[PDB]
Amino acid sequence: MLAKLCKTIYPLADLLARPLPEGVDPLKLEIYLTDEDFEFALDMTRDEYNALPAWKQVNLKKAKGLF
Numbered sequence: 450m451l452a453k454l455c456k457t458i459y460p461l462a463d464l465l466a467r468p469l470p471e472g473v474d475p476l477k478l479e480i481y482l483t484d485e486d487f488e489f490a491l492d493m494t495r496d497e498y499n500a501l502p503a504w505k506q507v508n509l510k511k512a513k514g515l516f
Contacts, residue, residue, distance in 0.1 A: 456483075457472075458481055458482050458483040458485075458486050459472060459473045459481050459482070459486075460486075461482060461486040461489055461490045464478060464481075465478075465490065465513075465514065465515065466514070476516075477510075477516060478490065478510065478515035478516060479491055479493075479495070479498055479506065479510060479515065479516070480495075482495070482515075483495065484496075490513055490515050491506075491509050491510055491513055491515060492509065492513070493506070493509065
């Protein structure tokens, strides 16, 4: 568990507007959602936004209501 990092995404719904966990950071939701969640939450990818602008990428988050 220490040597390997288990990347687990939190249910977009449960966090998109529901008593979400803690691993889920509010300041930035795009860091805890996989392409699937990313696709339905931001319509982008962790590897897409990862390179795209920080504001433009955010521009979408607000559009969906994540950030």
